[PDB]
Amino acid sequence: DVNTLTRFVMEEGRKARGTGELTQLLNSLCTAVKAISSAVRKAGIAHLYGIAGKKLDVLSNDLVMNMLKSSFATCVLVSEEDKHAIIVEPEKRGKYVVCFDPLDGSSNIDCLVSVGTIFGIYRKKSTDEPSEKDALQPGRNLVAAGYALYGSATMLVLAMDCGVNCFMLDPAIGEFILVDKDVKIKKKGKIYSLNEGYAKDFDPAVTEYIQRKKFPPDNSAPYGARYVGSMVADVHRTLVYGGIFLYPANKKSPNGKLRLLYECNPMAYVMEKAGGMATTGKEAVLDVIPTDIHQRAPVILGSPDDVLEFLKVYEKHS
Amino acid sequence: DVNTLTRFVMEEGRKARGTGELTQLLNSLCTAVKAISSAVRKAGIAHLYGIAGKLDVLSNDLVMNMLKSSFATCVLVSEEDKHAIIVEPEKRGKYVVCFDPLDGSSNIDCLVSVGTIFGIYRKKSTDEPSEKDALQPGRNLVAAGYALYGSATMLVLAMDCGVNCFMLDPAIGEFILVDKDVKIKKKGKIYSLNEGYAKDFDPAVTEYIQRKKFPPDNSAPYGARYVGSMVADVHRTLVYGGIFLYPANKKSPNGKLRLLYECNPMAYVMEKAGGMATTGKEAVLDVIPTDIHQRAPVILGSPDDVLEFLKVYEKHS
Amino acid sequence: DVNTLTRFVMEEGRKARGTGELTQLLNSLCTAVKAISSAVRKAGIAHLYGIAGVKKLDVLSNDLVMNMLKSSFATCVLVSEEDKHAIIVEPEKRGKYVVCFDPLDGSSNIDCLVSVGTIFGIYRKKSTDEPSEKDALQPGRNLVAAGYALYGSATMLVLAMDCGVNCFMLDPAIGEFILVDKDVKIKKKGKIYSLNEGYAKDFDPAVTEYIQRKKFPPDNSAPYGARYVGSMVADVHRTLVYGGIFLYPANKKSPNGKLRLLYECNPMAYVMEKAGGMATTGKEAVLDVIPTDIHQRAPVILGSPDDVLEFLKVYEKHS
Amino acid sequence: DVNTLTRFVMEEGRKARGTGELTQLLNSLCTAVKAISSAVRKAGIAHLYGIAGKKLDVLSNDLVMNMLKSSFATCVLVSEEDKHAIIVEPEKRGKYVVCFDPLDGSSNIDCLVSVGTIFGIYRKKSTDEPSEKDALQPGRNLVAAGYALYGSATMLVLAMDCGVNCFMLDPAIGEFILVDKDVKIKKKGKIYSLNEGYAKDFDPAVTEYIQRKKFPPDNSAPYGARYVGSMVADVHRTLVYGGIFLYPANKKSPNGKLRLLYECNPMAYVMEKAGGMATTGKEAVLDVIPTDIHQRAPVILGSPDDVLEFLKVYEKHS
Numbered sequence A, D: 001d002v003n004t005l006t007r008f009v010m011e012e013g014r015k016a017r018g019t020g021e022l023t024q025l026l027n028s029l030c031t032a033v034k035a036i037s038s039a040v041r042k043a044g045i046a047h048l049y050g051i052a053g054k055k056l057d058v059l060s061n062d063l064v065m066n067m068l069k070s071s072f073a074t075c076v077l078v079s080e081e082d083k084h085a086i087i088v089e090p091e092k093r094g095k096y097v098v099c100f101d102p103l104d105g106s107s108n109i110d111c112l113v114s115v116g117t118i119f120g121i122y123r124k125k126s127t128d129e130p131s132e133k134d135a136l137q138p139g140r141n142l143v144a145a146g147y148a149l150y151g152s153a154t155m156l157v158l159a160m161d162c163g164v165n166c167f168m169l170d171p172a173i174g175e176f177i178l179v180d181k182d183v184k185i186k187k188k189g190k191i192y193s194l195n196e197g198y199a200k201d202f203d204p205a206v207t208e209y210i211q212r213k214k215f216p217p218d219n220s221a222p223y224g225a226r227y228v229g230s231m232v233a234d235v236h237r238t239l240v241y242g243g244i245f246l247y248p249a250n251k252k253s254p255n256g257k258l259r260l261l262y263e264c265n266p267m268a269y270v271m272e273k274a275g276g277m278a279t280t281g282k283e284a285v286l287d288v289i290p291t292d293i294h295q296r297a298p299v300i301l302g303s304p305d306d307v308l309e310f311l312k313v314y315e316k317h318s
Numbered sequence B: 001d002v003n004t005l006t007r008f009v010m011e012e013g014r015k016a017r018g019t020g021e022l023t024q025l026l027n028s029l030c031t032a033v034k035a036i037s038s039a040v041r042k043a044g045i046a047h048l049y050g051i052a053g054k055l056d057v058l059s060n061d062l063v064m065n066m067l068k069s070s071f072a073t074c075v076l077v078s079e080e081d082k083h084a085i086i087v088e089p090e091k092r093g094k095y096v097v098c099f100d101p102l103d104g105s106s107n108i109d110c111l112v113s114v115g116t117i118f119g120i121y122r123k124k125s126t127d128e129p130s131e132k133d134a135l136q137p138g139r140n141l142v143a144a145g146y147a148l149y150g151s152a153t154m155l156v157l158a159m160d161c162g163v164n165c166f167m168l169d170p171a172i173g174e175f176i177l178v179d180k181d182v183k184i185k186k187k188g189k190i191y192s193l194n195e196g197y198a199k200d201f202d203p204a205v206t207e208y209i210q211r212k213k214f215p216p217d218n219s220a221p222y223g224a225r226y227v228g229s230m231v232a233d234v235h236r237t238l239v240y241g242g243i244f245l246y247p248a249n250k251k252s253p254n255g256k257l258r259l260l261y262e263c264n265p266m267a268y269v270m271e272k273a274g275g276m277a278t279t280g281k282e283a284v285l286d287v288i289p290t291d292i293h294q295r296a297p298v299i300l301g302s303p304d305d306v307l308e309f310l311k312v313y314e315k316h317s
Numbered sequence C: 001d002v003n004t005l006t007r008f009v010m011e012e013g014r015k016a017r018g019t020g021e022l023t024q025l026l027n028s029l030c031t032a033v034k035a036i037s038s039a040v041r042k043a044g045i046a047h048l049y050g051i052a053g054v055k056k057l058d059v060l061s062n063d064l065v066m067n068m069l070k071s072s073f074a075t076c077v078l079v080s081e082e083d084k085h086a087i088i089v090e091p092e093k094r095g096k097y098v099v100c101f102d103p104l105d106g107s108s109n110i111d112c113l114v115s116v117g118t119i120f121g122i123y124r125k126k127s128t129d130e131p132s133e134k135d136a137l138q139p140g141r142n143l144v145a146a147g148y149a150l151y152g153s154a155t156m157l158v159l160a161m162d163c164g165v166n167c168f169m170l171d172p173a174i175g176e177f178i179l180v181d182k183d184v185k186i187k188k189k190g191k192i193y194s195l196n197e198g199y200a201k202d203f204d205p206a207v208t209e210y211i212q213r214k215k216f217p218p219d220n221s222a223p224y225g226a227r228y229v230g231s232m233v234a235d236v237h238r239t240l241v242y243g244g245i246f247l248y249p250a251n252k253k254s255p256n257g258k259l260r261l262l263y264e265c266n267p268m269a270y271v272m273e274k275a276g277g278m279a280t281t282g283k284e285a286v287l288d289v290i291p292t293d294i295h296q297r298a299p300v301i302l303g304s305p306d307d308v309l310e311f312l313k314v315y316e317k318h319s
């Protein structure tokens, strides 16, 4: 029996016996993702080049912002594109807070590298008028999170209490088809992923861990390396094939490089619901209590056995 | 003035004052690429999952059938077939095509970028068409390039007139020229290779990479990128500059990538863009093949970067 | 503020405070319509012609609607022209709704690329017994929702319910039905008449006179223009958009008409009335006919109120 | 062996051993048709209705005009949209003259009625400077003509000396696939098509002919009636199923309503190449010598036996 994102979300929402807001929020997000996908694949670019005689990152942010506002299900929206949190006007306010990266990896979009949209949804905790503070909740409080990967094909990965589910976008009918149910990551993988160009500035624990991947002390087979440079692409591969992904702090970026609210937490949430792990090295990414919407956070995630191994090394140097 | 792949190819073909075969060959290849793109993006997958109650193989079938039906080819070598395919007499043309229908499909499960690579040669002898016709050095290529099915689909075509990039507009199924006579940066800031092979690296590769991470002159270290799909990594190299490596080692003296449909085409694109592509010992394009599926080591990209690698290579030779 | 079919239906369903079944039913129908549209526009036809080295569209369309409706868990009885008998949903997937539909209206002459469409009518099961064909034998007056999808120059879904008639345009770039016309109302009177005049010889006297009045106005006013696509969804939609009248009447040859009551007449009659229009068999409102056979035919004259009323005047003159 | 419009045209052009201009002209027209089709099917309409926060007839004209000019194959362009003939600038001039209707039937497009693009291509016959006069050639001089129908699906019908060929647009790959080769219309059909709302003003010959279709003299079954209201739709159905199409002259319109250069001649050309007929009642549409680029012309076309029958009636009243 075929299942669609719309059908799947509607059913889960029905079981929750709530107001239906999260359902509308996700439906709206889904529509925005399809619009972003269409623009990313360059539909209509011919008109830009004069067949008849805005930047993608900006368009993507506009699509998400507008669809979420018009869903009547949100009150505070934090985007990687905007310096300040966006406060939804009173007549369209809902009880949810959304932190998102409209188009992850767009910086190197020129090379047609895979790009994506990352999102994390929280239920407003405070009763105060909506403000940026409502987005400062630990990832542990997420009600839903995931991402859309615009790679060889477009896929939406949605994680919630019921687990992780993957939907493939069928461009013929503009429908997200459920192709992988209640996904779980491999206990242990054979791929490590990180920008080794930072080698010179790596912390000792990262240096040793990577060394163990290339020169297994037990003389087992060395791990293969992959690093697309786009978090959504690297994380998704990690989910599908297992292994480990790292974007640790650098000497130059003492608090890591990736952002906690819309890059780390969402992926950490997907990973844990898939039976995986995500740590800053000191604690679970999901337990970090944010003080700034754009603060950075180090992150090491993936197969449990792989992350545990890294933590062992980390502890040795602590 | 907008330009399309069809219009561009037709015009160049007209200037050559030939039979029009290469034009038809490229038109057919273009159509196949759009079909592969459509399937790669998973159009119609809903029917596979029961809404009404392999990609590598499909891609090879699309290229094979379109090329044969173009009446412009006589010998077809594919990464998917053990032996060279000989076009039936009634559909034979003067060209030989070596191609990889869907490069990087091995990891297609993670939705990693994939692509199609191709190299076109003019048959050199009047001998009945055979596998030998595809054993020409890349230096003899008349046209070569690839289609990248990434965030968007792009077709990169290299010929004597240079390198031109066309973006596929899915709304009208038309390849739009967006970058003309492309040239790669003299020097980049990104190195690309599977460092998981570190333990088995050749001494020259180990030192070169060490210089990218720990520049002896204390300059900024290079960033690392390795998609795992040749078309994706090579295209990034072309767009941003830098270097790409899939070298040889004691255990793989000739490398892992294939000369005919992976190395030669990319080497050709690189040189036409003012870049370089070496096996370490000689230019990839000068290697004279003896086997259609033979492997070849390859280091390509910005000239200053490749030259630097060669300096290190020489140091260990 | 943009609105989509999914958002619109979800909201209306929420206001009804029910089980959410009709919402799932409509979502599923929507998905099927997009799939039908894709196939109708011939996506992938290249594969059929050997680009890489097959079932009829009416059959595929029926399969799409049937499968999506069954999988919605919101239906129990499905009537289509395809199957002679009503389809009874298996117990484990039964919902409280009954759906009567025409998977691909006008497919008979589809080779000419004439506009085609999907027509549907949704009823709430009334009986307490086991689902059967009988549950589809309700007068159109009992419809909870009805409409059609027109696969013409563009694809549009017209949905009629108590709240009125709303038109959604399918944006192929994102596979989303965009609301472009809200609470639509048909013009009080139009200037176009639509029917197959090839049946002239067998026309009922009332139809003959009425048409005569459209071509040769009694008060020498401007004669009406004629349009007849041959596809009910196309002709009816034009009638809704431009106003006027559509006829597929009965006669000596066809005493009960040619179009089907359950999945052709009732749905269009429902859309017409919700839009402030009319739909009569000549004797009574189409919506009031109590069916005794799921495939029974019914004569139908619908469109602008003033035009239908005028027809009825002529009809009465011959009665 | 699959064939595409691009492949088909390139091959025919090669056999002509010319400059390649008509090939480029057709390729360019093909691209324009795909762009028009995309817009007609309303791709991107979501952006018009605010998903992120120019009329079709005008856009269509712009697409055809721009693509034809940029083909470097034309010198004079006549469109139903522009009062005066468009003269291609010197640096982009080619030897062909094109008369076209960018979007036929767009007047009633609000009802989603089928619409289409009609075109007729002539070779400039003069040696002087390009002018409106170069478009005043009888249809008999056409080198190529046809139309694109944007109906349930999009199809391009191309007629040339080699015959009539039909190509279906596959939206998945934006390719026109040849599905019907060297098409021939039925000797006799069973459908008549005309706006009977003009009955009161019908010419006596038209009145009698239609009367014969409804009340047959040989007691054969009456013809069925069909009238979409869009010439491309009605003419295509006539081609596919056979029969007859009429848009005759009456009391008020002695010269008919449809335009000779970009509506009548192209369809007349398609019909004759398909073994059909097209008459004004007095002579073959293709033999009319135009004196005004926008002049009207009566037209009766379709299956030969049907047109011949009409002509018999016409002669009876002459």
Ligand SMILES: NC(=O)c1ccc(OCP(=O)(O)O)c2c1Cc1scnc1-2
Pocket: A009, A010, A012, A013, A014, A016, A017, A018, A019, A020, A021, A022, A023, A026, A143, A160, A161, A162
């Ligand atoms: N525990 C959960 O995962 C949970 C809790 C409350 C919910 O809805 C609450 P509402 O906003 O309707 O008040 C929803 C979920 C999963 C989904 S999917 C669509 N809605 C929900």
Ligand SMILES: NC(=O)c1ccc(OCP(=O)(O)O)c2c1Cc1scnc1-2
Pocket: B009, B010, B012, B013, B014, B016, B017, B018, B019, B020, B021, B022, B023, B026, B142, B159, B160, B161
């Ligand atoms: N020098 C060149 O780059 C060259 C030589 C011969 C050619 O065709 C010869 P034909 O097959 O028509 O005999 C073509 C080219 C560039 C292009 S683009 C389309 N055709 C050609």
Ligand SMILES: NC(=O)c1ccc(OCP(=O)(O)O)c2c1Cc1scnc1-2
Pocket: C009, C010, C012, C013, C014, C016, C017, C018, C019, C020, C021, C022, C023, C026, C144, C161, C162, C163
């Ligand atoms: N009066 C109405 O128009 C009405 C009554 C009950 C309904 O749902 C009942 P449910 O199946 O949820 O129990 C719905 C409607 C309009 C829409 S749109 C989606 N659902 C409904």
Ligand SMILES: NC(=O)c1ccc(OCP(=O)(O)O)c2c1Cc1scnc1-2
Pocket: D009, D010, D012, D013, D014, D016, D017, D018, D019, D020, D021, D022, D023, D026, D143, D160, D161, D162
């Ligand atoms: N006999 C014909 O129908 C004829 C004559 C000359 C032609 O090309 C003349 P050119 O512009 O290349 O000089 C072409 C055709 C059919 C086609 S299809 C593409 N080109 C042609």
